[PDB]
């Protein structure tokens, strides 16, 4: 097993094991990955990822998983992703939309909040 994996390879192999295309667990993946490279902790996010699967877990458990165990998780919010309409958020996020609270946490399942023009924020939440 690779002791140093790139946010490219670690995103190809969360990918590899997950159903579906534009998943909330899809931008999980992403979200996990950006924020694993900007504060280089993609070892460790790849190790509890390995672990959790080892457990039997799903990989999309694996992933909620991540934003439990891993303290960046609870150190950093979800990002905001900037949208032009409702149309624009992956048919398979279309009923994981909430609006968000005042402070989501990823660790609390908020995945990323798409801001809209209206100047409101669908917050994406497993």
């Not at 140093?4 to 909330?24: C, N, Q, R, V, W």
């Not at 979200?31 to 999309?60: M, R, W, Y």
């Amino acid at each position: 097993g690779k002791p140093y994996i790139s946010a490219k390879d670690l995103k190809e192999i969360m990918y590899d094991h997950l159903p579906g295309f534009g998943t909330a667990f899809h931008q999980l993946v992403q979200v996990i990955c950006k924020i694993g490279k900007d504060n280089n902790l993609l070892d460790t996010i790849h190790a509890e990822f390995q672990a959790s699967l080892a457990d039997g877990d799903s990989p999309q458990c694996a992933l909620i998983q991540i934003t439990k165990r891993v303290p960046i998780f609870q150190d950093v919010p979800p990002p905001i992703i900037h949208i032009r309409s409702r149309g624009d958020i992956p048919r398979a996020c279309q009923k994981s939309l909430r609006p968000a609270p005042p402070s989501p946490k990823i660790d609390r399942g908020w995945v990323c909040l798409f801001k809209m023009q209206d100047g409101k924020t669908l917050g994406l939440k497993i």
